[PDB]
Amino acid sequence: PQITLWQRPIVTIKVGGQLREALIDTGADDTILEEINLPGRWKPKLIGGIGGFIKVRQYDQIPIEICGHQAIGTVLVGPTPANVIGRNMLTQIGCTLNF
């Protein structure tokens, strides 16, 4: 699709067998999801944003469906106030900015 920005650009994703809504976030380098049960090994990571840093679980090579497009990559799980799809996934689905 084309998505305008009059509202938050929220899409449906499937990840870990579960359905969620997430923001298409061009200001996010990585993909960060609120607490969600994902399978397998992970590494603890501290990440920074507006207001300080959070501890996340890093999961690699996680398949995700983003508004009906398939991607695979790193997903960080932790106490984010919003589920965000970052550039690591957006590049795989061919997402661009236009003006």
Ligand X SMILES: CC(C)CN(C[C@@H](O)[C@H](Cc1cc(F)cc(F)c1)NC(=O)O[C@H]1[C@H]2CO[C@H]3OC[C@@H]1[C@H]3C2)S(=O)(=O)c1ccc2nc(NC3CC3)sc2c1
**What separation in angstroms does the CA of 76 have from each of 10, 26, 45, 97?**
18, 16, 8, 24
Residues that bind a copy of itself (CB under 8 A): 1-6, 8-9, 23-29, 32, 47-54, 67, 69, 80-82, 84, 87, 90-91, 93-99
Nearer to a copy of itself, 38 or 95 (CB): 95
The DSSP output letter for 48 is: E
Minimum CB distance to ligand X, residue 18 (Å):
20
Write the DSSP symbol of residue 69: E
Which residues in the 2-21 window bind ligand X by CB under 6 A?
none
- Shortest distance (Å) from residue 56 CB to ligand X: 9
Q: Residue 11: which H helix or E strand, with range?
A: strand 10-15
How far is residue 73 from each of residues 8, 50, 83, 88, 92, measured CA to CA in Å?
23, 24, 15, 7, 9
Q: 60 an active-site residue?
A: no
Binding interface with ligand X (CB under 6 A): 23, 25, 27-30, 32, 47-50, 80-82, 84, 86
